């Protein structure tokens, strides 16, 4: 699209409509973009000394990108609630994007006095990496997505990436991608950039919780017909004499019943409690946390494989890195106290996946014989096994929406671990930069790189609309399901509202599983 | 096909052409075939005493088979190089085979003097087991495939197989397949045997190395928004008092960052070093090597599941059985010294799969509390887990090309472990035998089995052409990729050449990953 | 072309005719071919010490080649004379080649006594490097072309070539061409191999 200077390049679309089966969440926000790295690509690396587990090598670019991989960039409390309360599941189908009403300003810091003014002509160029030839950054839970609250103006993030490294230094194989080596489209004012995408058949996120659970799944009333090993030894006057007898598992017997499927896999996490007291006093934050390691650098295992966060009656506990944790609007960056964060809870799964903090089961160790007692041992890490079945990490309104499946020789069940939809070809990276403006050059020629540009930034609005599909409920469940509600009682502030000084804020994390489906 | 005696049953096709997307490697070689087991099927078994882990039972047949399950039976250094240097990947599509110019000779060892001459009439019969009713031997890394070097004449291997066994003895279930119970086609001279095959949709072998790596994958510039557990206890005058505080992972924080996918699986191997010194002195060749075991016989775990062979700066090490090892042209059969072999290296993977010699990660053990320190333990064997992603063993010019997927109730990701393409219905076994020639029988009848045949063998050439598909490169990588080159400096002998006495020889193993794709 | 065992795969053409403007010199000769380097490619180099101006590095092949880059393989004194006496100049235009009546023998040196006999089946394979992907040796004034005199039987030369070298040793850039990496056509007896060529506009040799 194209037009004039006194012509709005696009209108403001920010609705949300439900169609019974679909529902489209349109949404627009105003943004701003500075000139990063003063227009140059800069090489960047870990700090020489820095622990090995923390080295790196890569580049930062003068390019800034766009991102809305956060559910709340599309759903509004209320809306989300609608969804989350009457749908067995849902998934994204297609999207449409558009930047417009772009405007380029140029600040002038003459002595003790700045003065911003329109640089009409100068441009901002955009380009979408629709061929995925660029290090996909999104999906890395970074923060600089869209504001949950419309009215909020925002700054565009700067693109940076990482290649290979042998400590703080580069290794040859590492590649250096240059963003100008693409065909950016250049916008001036009166210019807009639209583009549209279509998702790929993915599974509806399961937005329901299970009423039955693996173990308790058969019918009480009837005993099976298969037998199991009831007792081993037997009374012989005073002493026992080994004599194995078997029984037919019934209701009273349950624990012993024969089955057909196994809980999901696991990778044991340390348990910490919301109650300061209980927790051993010391620094096992890193030392005790569950991790894995590549090329000799141990990394953390955050968002561990999807597994319930606490047994019955222990909402007080949680994994050291088995859950998602968001900050309460305002919460500072580092070492903030428990009271400043919102920890997610995944009890809803208990029913199928193991509890993060407790071992999977316990396999037998030795082979018993008359002169040898029967061994056994608990298992803290069980990789996928036939017959296992499980549930993936719920979603949360202010959580990630999707993530790119890495291009590898092999993947195994790609639901992104941080939760979300695992996409092979996700929404392409959208980039934006401000074509430089060489400030006054010298009369006599010089072949040096230009270094003195006009100080200036851009701004303008952006809009994103997405169509989601739904799987409606359908249970013959007689008694009421659970629903997500807002507290009745009076409060000094409404949840998901602007305070007295107009600061919007999300009180709690809102999950997705409320409706109840049987297993 | 058919014709006369003074008529070449086929010409010599040994080209190789590239078409931009495909590339066909035609190739012909001269061969020779003796008469095995003096024409009879012989029962064969382990040696009574022999360690249990080494028993067996099966048969050897008078039949010899054909095989080219080695990349170099089709690619020529140069060619291979072309491929390997400009292609994100490739795979086989179809093939065509033909035997021809068959000729049957008959030696005469009269006293101190042999004398070979043409037995025109007598025949050689061939037959392809296109229904896979015969124990698929190929794929077992046996040696008797085609000569890498054209000019080389070769001997055809003899077919043998193995069934069940209870120690050195047979067990009933074990089957005994007889090769005459097939409809062999019989060739006399002037007769040729052609046949063609078509591969099945398989995945292009990934012939590229990764520039990013799981851990270092997100964007440096921006800190995430999810929080993790920064510290546990806290300064209380003199003493610490447990007080968990959380932080928002940033660049400096990296190791702690939240992610979305896990390294490939693992099965720990012992580390040995190319440097004699380091290595503990003793015999842990078997005792210390990683293995598994069926029906009480521990077998070795060679070509362990695909996993990088050494961390940064340790090209000197390697798994005890985690790598492929070829002999330097000439190297004898047993206990040959390190200097006689070429060990493959899979550093290229590091980026996704764990290091063979070092544990996967470390899960937590106990549940901590005030009166209990936080436990933890390293994991040396991790079975596939959701979110895991990885790369398969590279290929190597002189490596296997494919392998038959065993007919079972269940497989999991069939890329053959020794590397190659996992095929459900691979190129059918091709067999060949020389119809016997009863040497002079007695005038008076006898119903005994004939035992005195004419001494004779066969020869003639064989040709195999195969069409491979390619996936061309396509990265916006600015700086140069790595390529495979031959050393500039002078040398007494060219690599992949015949020495002074015309002995072709492959200097080093050549992999496949050189081109660099992002993760 | 193809046929049987008791069938001459080609006749003997050895004429020479003048047409006023053209003149065609046909010519046939009998030849023989051993098995070189006992069937293998052998690496070859100057003799370590040997003056520098005389070092080299290259290979010898089990392959033998054909050559008639000598005017007398086509002209007969007399003929040549005709030409040479009444023509301001001349040049070649096209050619046609054919091998035939191929026969493979096999000697038997049993003790103090050899005995040659027909190995009917076995073959001889031929192939023309029509894409010039092989080190062009001919033109190097080598000797093993055709006999000037028809009646003369001859032996076929063996193919060998030279690459780069840093003294008596090889240098990487040097290439090693393998003759089997071509699609040889295989002849058995009763088999013939013909092929034809066409020269390119060149200047008449000034014969005045």
Q: Which of A424, A420, A427 shows the shortest CA–CA distance to A407?
A: A424
Report CA-CA distances (Å) from B128 to A216, B68, B163, B281, B427: 55, 14, 21, 50, 10
Strand ranges for B295-353 from DSSP E: 297-300, 317-319, 325-327, 341-343
- Say whether A305 and B478 touch across the interface (CB within 8 A): no
* DSSP class per residue in B209-239: EESS-SSTTS-TTS-BSSEEEEEEEEEETTE
User: What's the burial of A370, exposed, middle or buried (CB within 10 Å: 0-12/13-18/19+)?
Assistant: exposed
Per-residue burial over B400-423, b if 16 or more Cβ lie within 10 Å, else e, is bbbbbbeeeeeeeeebbbebbbbb
Residue pair C47/C53 in contact by the 8 Å Cβ criterion: no
List subunits contacting chain A, requiring 3 or more Cβ pairs under 8 Å.
B
- The answer to whether the CB atoms of C5 and B5 lie below 8 A apart is yes
**Residue B488 contacts C where some CB pair is shorter than 8 Å:** yes
In degrees rounded to 5, what are phi and psi of residue A515? -65, 145
Q: Among candidates A158, A333, A169, A294, which has minimal Cα distance to B252? A: A333
Q: H or E element: which one contains C78?
A: helix C77-85
Min CA distance, B460 vs chain C (Å)? Answer: 9
In angstroms, the CA A382 to CA B383 distance is 7
Give the separation between CA B122 and CA B105, rounded to whole angstroms: 9
Quick one: closest CA in C to B463, which residue? C183
Q: Who among B255, B364, B387 is closest to A417 (CB)?
A: B387
C-alpha B246: how far from chain center: 49
Whether C186 sits inside 8 A of B11 (CB atoms) is yes
For A360-429, strand residue ranges (E) read 361-363, 377-379, 381-382, 402-404, 410-411, 421-423
Taking the C-alpha atoms of residue A375 and residue B181, their distance in angstroms, rounded to an integer, is: 53
Dihedral sign for Cα A278, A280, A283, A288, please. Answer: negative
CB contact under 8 A, C181 and B15: yes
B39 secondary structure, DSSP code: G
Partner-chain contact A292 B262, CB within 8 Å: yes
Q: Give me the phi and psi of B159, to 5 degrees please.
A: -70, 135
What CA–CA distance (Å, rounded) separates A380 from B378? 11
From CA B330, how far away is CA A224, in angstroms rounded?
66
Q: Report the b/e string of B266-298 with b at 16+ CB within 10 A.
A: bbbbbbbeeeeeeeeeeeeeeeebbeeeeeeee
Rounded to the nearest angstrom, the minimum Cα separation between B469 and chain A is 17
- Helices and strands in chain A: count of H runs, count of E runs: 1, 35
Q: What structural domains does chain A harbor?
A: 1-519 (2.170.30.10)
Whole-angstrom distance, CA of residue A80 vs CA of residue A484: 10
Cβ within 8 Å of A, B 320-379? 350-352, 354-355, 358-365, 367-377, 379
Place of tokens 């927790």: A279
Q: Could you tell me the two tokens for B150?
A: 């054209």
CA pair distance C57, C162, nearest whole angstrom: 6
- Output b/e per residue, A135-147; b: 16+ Cβ within 10 A: bbbbbbbbebbbb
Q: Tell how far CA B413 is from the center of its chain.
A: 16
C-alpha to C-alpha distance for A504 and A339, rounded to whole angstroms: 19
Token code pair at residue B190:
């002037």
- The answer for residues whose C-beta is within 8 angstroms of residue B463's C-beta and 6 or more apart is B10, B12, B13, B14, B26, B27, B28, B29, B97, B98, B99, B100
- Cα-flanking dihedrals φ and ψ of residue A372, to 5°? -165, 115
* Cα dist from A469 to A93, A401, B200, B501, C52, whole Å: 6, 14, 36, 73, 82
User: What is the rounded CA–CA span in Å between residue B137 and residue A49?
Assistant: 55
Which of B11, B113, B494 is the closest to C174 by Cβ? B494
Separation CA A324–CA A331 (nearest Å) = 16
3-state secondary structure A133-157: CCCCCCCCCECCCCCCCCCCCEECC
Nearest-5° Cα angle at B440, B434 to B443? 140
CA distance A272 to A50: 28
Q: From the DSSP assignment, how many helices (H) and strands (E) are in chain C? A: 1, 15
Give chain C's radius of gyration (CA, Å). Answer: 21
- Name the minimum distance, in Å, from the CA of C108 to any CA of chain B: 8
B489 vs C172, C180, C183: nearest CB: C172
- Structure resolution in Å? 3.0
Question: A274's torsion region: left (phi>0), alpha (psi -120 to 50) or beta?
Answer: alpha
Helices (H), B365-440: none
**Residues in C touching B11 (Cβ below 8 Å):** 125, 183-186
Six-digit token pair at B223?
A: 């800190």
Checking A336-342 for CB contacts under 8 A at 24+ apart, the result is A336/B227, A336/B245, A336/B246, A336/B247, A337/B243, A337/B244, A337/B245, A337/B246, A338/A274, A338/A276, A338/B244, A338/B245, A338/B246, A340/B246, A341/B227, A341/B246, A342/A508, A342/A509
Technique that determined the structure: X-ray
Backbone angles phi, psi at C45, to 5 degrees: -150, 160
Q: Which residues of C touch B498 (CB under 8 A)?
A: 40-43, 59, 176
Contact A105, A34 (CB under 8 A): no
Torsion C139-C144-C146-C149 (CA) sign:
positive
List CB contacts of A138: < 8 A, sequence separation 6 or more.
A65, A67, A69, A403, A404, A426, A427, A429
Burial code (b: 16+ CB inside 10 Å, e: under 16) for A498-517 equals eeeeeeeebbebbbbbbbbb
Distance CA A192, CA A12 (A): 13
Q: Rounded CA gap, C41 and C19, in Å? A: 47
CB contact (8 A) between residue B250 and residue A333: yes
B283-to-B113, B276, B289 alpha-carbon distances in Å:
50, 14, 10
Instruction: Measure the CA–CA gap between A160 and A157, rounded to whole angstroms.
Output: 9
CB of A152 closer than 8 Å to CB of A504: yes
Tokens 């911003």 sit on residue:
A116
State yes or no: chains A and C have 3 or more CB pairs below 8 A.
Answer: no
Residue A315 region, left (φ>0) first, then alpha (ψ -120 to 50), else beta? alpha
Cβ burial B123-145 (10 Å sphere, 16+ → b, else e): bbbbbbbeeeebbbbbbebeeeb
Alpha helices (runs of H) in B70-149, residue ranges in sequence order? 77-85
For testing contact with chain C, the best of B6, B74, B77, B120 (most C CBs within 10 A): B6
Sheet strands (E) in A227-279: 227-236, 239-248, 266-267, 271-273
CB A297 within 8 A of CB B215: yes
Gap between the Cα atoms of B320 and B302, Å rounded: 8
Residues in chain B with CB shorter than 8 Å from the CB of A289 are 229, 364
Count of residues in chain A? 519
Residue C167: is it exposed, middle or buried by C-beta count within 10 angstroms (0-12/13-18/19+)? Answer: middle
Question: A205-206 and A87-106 as β-strands: parallel, antiparallel, unpaired?
Answer: antiparallel
Q: Are C25 and C41 in contact, with CB atoms under 8 Å apart?
A: no
Q: What is the DSSP letter of A354?
A: P
Residue of chain A whose Cα is closest to the Cα of B266? A383
Nearest CA in chain C to B4: C4
The residues near A339 (Cβ < 8 Å, ≥ 6 apart) are none
Of B386, C108, B146, residue with least CA distance to A265? B386
Q: Which CA distances in Å does A425 have to A8, A200, B46, B228, B251?
A: 33, 8, 54, 29, 26
How many Å apart are CA A245 and CA C171, to the nearest integer? 82
Best probe of the C interface among B116, B490, B503, B507, by most C CBs < 10 A, is: B490
Residues of C in contact with B494 (CB under 8 A): 43, 170, 172, 174, 176
C40, B488: Cβ pair inside 8 Å?
no
Whether residue B387 contacts residue B272, with contact meaning beta carbons closer than 8 Å, is answered with no
Backbone CA torsion sign across B345, B351, B353, B356:
positive
CB-neighbour burial class of residue B216 (10 A; exposed 0-12, middle 13-18, buried 19+)? buried
Residues of chain A neighbouring B357 (CB-CB closer than 8 A): none
């Amino acid at each position: 699209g194209a037009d004039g200077v006194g012509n709005s390049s696009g209108n403001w679309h920010c609705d949300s409509t439900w169609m019974g089966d679909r529902v489209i969440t349109t949404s627009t926000r105003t943004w701003a973009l500075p000139t990063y790295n003063n227009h140059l690509y800069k090489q960047i690396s870990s700090q020489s000394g820095a622990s090995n587990d923390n080295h790196y090598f890569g580049y930062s670019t003068p390019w800034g990108y766009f991102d809305f991989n956060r559910f709340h960039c599309h759903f509004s409390p209320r809306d989300w609630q609608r969804l989350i309360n009457n749908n067995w599941g849902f998934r994204p189908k297609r999207l449409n994007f558009k930047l417009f009403n772009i405007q380029v300003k140029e600040v002038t810091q003459n002595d003790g006095t700045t003065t911003i003014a329109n640089n009409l002509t100068s441009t901002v160029q955009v380009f979408t990496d629709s061929e995925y030839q660029l290090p996909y950054v999104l999906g890395s839970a970074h923060q600089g997505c869209l504001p949950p609250f419309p009215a909020d103006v925002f700054m565009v993030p700067q693109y940076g990436y990482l290649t290979l490294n042998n400590g703080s230094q580069a290794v040859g194989r590492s590649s250096f991608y240059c963003l100008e080596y693409f065909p950016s489209q250049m916008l001036r004012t009166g210019n807009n950039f639209t583009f549209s995408y279509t998702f790929e058949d993915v599974p509806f996120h399961s937005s329901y919780a299970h009423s039955q659970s693996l173990d308790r799944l058969m019918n009480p009333l009837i005993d099976q017909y298969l037998y199991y090993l009831s007792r081993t030894n037997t009374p012989s006057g005073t002493t026992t004499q080994s004599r194995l007898q078997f029984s037919q598992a019934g209701a009273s017997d349950i624990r012993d019943q024969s089955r057909n499927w196994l809980p999901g896999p696991c990778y044991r996490q340390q348990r910490v409690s919301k109650t300061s007291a209980d927790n051993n006093n010391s620094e096992y934050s890193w030392t005790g946390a569950t991790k894995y390691h590549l090329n000799g650098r141990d990394s953390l295992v955050n968002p561990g494989p999807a597994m319930a966060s606490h047994k019955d009656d222990e909402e007080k506990f949680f994994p050291q890195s088995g859950v998602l944790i968001f900050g309460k609007q305002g919460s500072e960056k580092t070492n903030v106290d428990i009271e400043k964060v919102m920890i997610t809870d995944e009890e809803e799964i208990r029913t199928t996946n193991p509890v993060a903090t407790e071992q999977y089961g316990s396999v037998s160790t030795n082979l018993q014989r008359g002169n040898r007692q029967a061994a056994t041992a608990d298992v803290n890490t069980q990789g996928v096994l036939p017959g296992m079945v499980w549930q993936d990490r719920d979603v949360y309104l202010q959580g990630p929406i999707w993530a790119k499946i890495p291009h590898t020789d092999g993947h195994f069940h790609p639901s992104p671990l941080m939760g979300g939809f695992g996409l092979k070809h996700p929404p392409p990276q959208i980039l934006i930069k401000n074509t430089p403006v060489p400030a006054n050059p010298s009369t006599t020629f010089s072949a040096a790189k230009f270094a003195s540009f006009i100080t200036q930034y851009s701004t303008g609005q952006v809009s994103v609309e997405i169509e989601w599909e739904l799987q409606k409920e359908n249970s013959k469940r007689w008694n009421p399901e659970i629903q997500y509600t807002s507290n009745y009682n009076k409060s000094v502030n409404v949840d998901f509202t602007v305070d007295t000084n107009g600061v919007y804020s999300e009180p709690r994390p809102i999950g997705t599983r409320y409706l109840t489906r049987n297993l």
